[PDB]
Design an enzyme around this catalytic site. Structure first.
Site, mmCIF file in Angstrom:
data_model
loop_
_atom_site.group_PDB
_atom_site.id
_atom_site.type_symbol
_atom_site.label_atom_id
_atom_site.label_comp_id
_atom_site.label_asym_id
_atom_site.label_seq_id
_atom_site.Cartn_x
_atom_site.Cartn_y
_atom_site.Cartn_z
ATOM 1 N N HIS A 76 -6.096 14.520 5.925
ATOM 2 C CA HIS A 76 -8.095 14.603 5.009
ATOM 3 C C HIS A 76 -8.526 13.723 5.419
ATOM 4 O O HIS A 76 -7.992 12.769 6.651
ATOM 5 C CB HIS A 76 -7.524 14.545 3.512
ATOM 6 C CG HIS A 76 -6.250 13.151 3.216
ATOM 7 N ND1 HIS A 76 -4.675 13.268 3.819
ATOM 8 C CD2 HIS A 76 -6.194 12.134 3.093
ATOM 9 C CE1 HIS A 76 -4.025 12.090 2.968
ATOM 10 N NE2 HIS A 76 -5.003 11.036 2.844
ATOM 11 N N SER B 104 -4.760 3.291 -5.461
ATOM 12 C CA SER B 104 -3.680 4.094 -4.306
ATOM 13 C C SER B 104 -2.376 3.699 -3.613
ATOM 14 O O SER B 104 -2.526 2.263 -3.567
ATOM 15 C CB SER B 104 -4.525 5.153 -3.405
ATOM 16 O OG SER B 104 -4.763 3.891 -1.575
ATOM 17 N N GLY C 136 1.123 -0.998 -0.315
ATOM 18 C CA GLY C 136 -0.194 0.144 0.139
ATOM 19 C C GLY C 136 0.793 1.191 -0.376
ATOM 20 O O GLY C 136 -0.303 2.708 -0.730
ATOM 21 N N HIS D 17 -6.787 11.636 8.358
ATOM 22 C CA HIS D 17 -4.944 11.160 8.744
ATOM 23 C C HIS D 17 -4.378 12.055 8.021
ATOM 24 O O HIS D 17 -4.609 12.424 6.795
ATOM 25 C CB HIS D 17 -4.977 9.457 8.693
ATOM 26 C CG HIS D 17 -5.278 8.839 6.731
ATOM 27 N ND1 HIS D 17 -6.634 9.511 6.878
ATOM 28 C CD2 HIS D 17 -3.834 8.640 6.768
ATOM 29 C CE1 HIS D 17 -6.549 9.292 5.283
ATOM 30 N NE2 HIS D 17 -5.124 8.955 5.131
ATOM 31 N N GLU E 255 -1.069 10.668 5.535
ATOM 32 C CA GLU E 255 0.199 9.500 5.209
ATOM 33 C C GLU E 255 1.106 8.813 6.235
ATOM 34 O O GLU E 255 1.569 9.776 6.338
ATOM 35 C CB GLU E 255 0.378 9.615 3.914
ATOM 36 C CG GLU E 255 -0.603 10.390 2.722
ATOM 37 C CD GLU E 255 -1.671 8.980 2.423
ATOM 38 O OE1 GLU E 255 -1.269 7.748 2.799
ATOM 39 O OE2 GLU E 255 -2.636 9.766 2.959
ATOM 40 N N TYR F 149 -9.496 0.099 -3.536
ATOM 41 C CA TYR F 149 -10.252 0.127 -2.181
ATOM 42 C C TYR F 149 -12.128 -0.077 -2.663
ATOM 43 O O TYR F 149 -12.665 0.630 -3.837
ATOM 44 C CB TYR F 149 -10.301 1.292 -1.922
ATOM 45 C CG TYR F 149 -8.728 1.523 -0.787
ATOM 46 C CD1 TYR F 149 -7.216 2.153 -1.257
ATOM 47 C CD2 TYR F 149 -8.866 0.961 0.254
ATOM 48 C CE1 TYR F 149 -6.652 1.919 -0.337
ATOM 49 C CE2 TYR F 149 -8.084 1.098 0.951
ATOM 50 C CZ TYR F 149 -6.673 1.853 0.935
ATOM 51 O OH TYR F 149 -5.642 1.600 1.113
HETATM 52 O O1 LIG Z 1 -10.451 4.992 2.183
HETATM 53 C C1 LIG Z 1 -10.162 5.747 0.447
HETATM 54 O O2 LIG Z 1 -10.411 6.250 0.404
HETATM 55 C C2 LIG Z 1 -8.951 6.998 0.974
HETATM 56 C C3 LIG Z 1 -8.605 7.814 1.333
HETATM 57 C C4 LIG Z 1 -7.381 8.816 1.218
HETATM 58 N N1 LIG Z 1 -6.195 7.901 2.103
HETATM 59 C C5 LIG Z 1 -6.429 6.631 2.314
HETATM 60 C C6 LIG Z 1 -5.473 6.305 3.094
HETATM 61 O O3 LIG Z 1 -4.885 6.746 3.316
HETATM 62 C C7 LIG Z 1 -5.770 4.599 3.725
HETATM 63 C C8 LIG Z 1 -7.106 4.197 3.018
HETATM 64 C C9 LIG Z 1 -7.959 4.930 2.874
HETATM 65 C C10 LIG Z 1 -7.659 6.412 2.414
HETATM 66 NI NI NI Z 2 -4.581 8.628 2.865
#
Ligand SMILES: O=C(O)c1ccnc2c(O)cccc12
Ligand code: NI
Ligand SMILES: [Cl-]
Ligand SMILES: [Zn+2]
Length: 348
Positions: free
Chosen positions: A269, A281, A163, A181, A183, A170
């Protein structure tokens, strides 16, 4: 630039779109990063896959049920891991009458309906699915191979972090959501919506991030005391009104399928999915990230939490500071407004 620190949207011509790292440098030259989040819709031409008519058989090893608890703008989300299931099994459950999307007009309607029922009828989320949907021959923004300095981690140590330096899929459903959160290691992030219903986002400017954590520590003192960075657990949800009520600057944006979303270092975010959809992602980095990585406050109560060794990056990009850094005397302060070094070319 971008003194309001508002979320920006970019429409790149197929020529600008070719080199990922460059365009990132470009948007940072336009101040896009000051918002913490930026949107980039690909050229009308470009497509990552031919058809998504084969994924129905694809399997989700560990879908999760999202139980949300709380009231008046503050909630804690718990994860109940379910049994493996296919995208087909998932789509049926996601489209059924129980988990279906409510009827609405303006977005502000679905939004109020979301913050009103997120504690009821806990949905399922097909999250953290190891894989990619990009076709092996695509050379533009391929989440599988972006070619950024983050590749240094795998190159030097051979270490893989699912990831982070590998793609995640997702599968969304209505009311599924992601807590507030930054990153891991405060890296950059790229999110592409392959198909399905929209995915809405909320973002806090990196220059105001500390204010958000102060607010979070105040409402969740227990969690704060147990961990130096409980928000990294991704269990905390806080509504917009609650942020407004306490003067926390933030912006909103909705991501519809075929659009890209970019989050920047230390940009908080959160959001939720409108319905059934798929998203891909992974994280990435620019020379600017190194300092953020060195100063990232990590989770101290869990074994699982991601931790990248900065050693190799400081050596290669900050040789003059390496010795001072290993001695713990590098007191460099970060300016969240400055664009990444690579953006020089677009600033002349
Ligand atoms: O669940 C999402 O669509 C999502 C959006 C933005 N960041 C995320 C992340 O950093 C980890 C897991 C999911 C997301
Ligand atoms: Ni995120
Ligand atoms: Cl608490
Ligand atoms: Zn923790």
């Amino acid at each position: 630039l971008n003194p309001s620190a508002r979320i920006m949207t970019f429409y790149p011509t197929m020529e600008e779109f070719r080199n990922f790292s460059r365009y990132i440098a470009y948007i940072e030259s336009q101040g896009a990063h000051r918002a913490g989040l930026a949107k980039v819709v690909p050229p009308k031409e470009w497509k990552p896959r031919a058809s998504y008519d084969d994924i129905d058989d694809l399997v989700i090893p560990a879908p999760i049920q999202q139980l949300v608890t709380g009231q008046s703008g503050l909630f804690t989300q718990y994860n109940i891991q379910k049994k493996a299931m296919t995208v087909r099994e998932f789509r049926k459950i996601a489209n059924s009458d129980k988990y279906c999307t409510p009827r609405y007009s303006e977005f502000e309607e679905l939004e109020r309906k979301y913050w009103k029922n997120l504690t009821f009828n806990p949905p399922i989320y097909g999250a953290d699915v190891n894989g990619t949907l990009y076709e092996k021959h695509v050379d533009e923004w391929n989440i599988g191979r972006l070619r950024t300095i983050l590749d240094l981690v795998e190159k030097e140590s051979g270490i893989t972090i699912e990831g982070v330096n590998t793609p995640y899929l997702y599968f969304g459903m209505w009311k599924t959501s992601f807590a507030w959160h930054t990153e891991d290691m405060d890296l950059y992030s790229i999110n592409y919506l392959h198909f399905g219903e929209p995915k809405s986002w909320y973002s806090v400017p990196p220059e105001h991030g500390k204010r958000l954590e102060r607010l979070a520590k105040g409402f969740f003192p227990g969690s704060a005391q147990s961990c130096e960075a409980f928000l990294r657990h991704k269990m905390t949800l806080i509504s917009p009104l609650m942020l407004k009520k306490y003067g926390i600057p933030f912006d909103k944006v909705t991501q519809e399928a075929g659009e890209f979303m970019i989050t920047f270092p230390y940009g908080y975010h959160a959001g939720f999915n409108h319905g059934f959809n798929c998203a891909e992602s992974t994280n990435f980095a620019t020379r600017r990230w190194i300092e953020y990585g060195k100063q990232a406050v990590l989770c101290s109560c869990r074994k699982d939490m991601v931790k990248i060794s900065m050693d190799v990056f400081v050596r290669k990009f900050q040789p003059e500071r390496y010795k001072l850094w290993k001695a713990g005397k590098d007191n460099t302060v970060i300016d969240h407004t400055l664009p990444t070094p690579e953006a020089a070319e677009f600033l002349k």
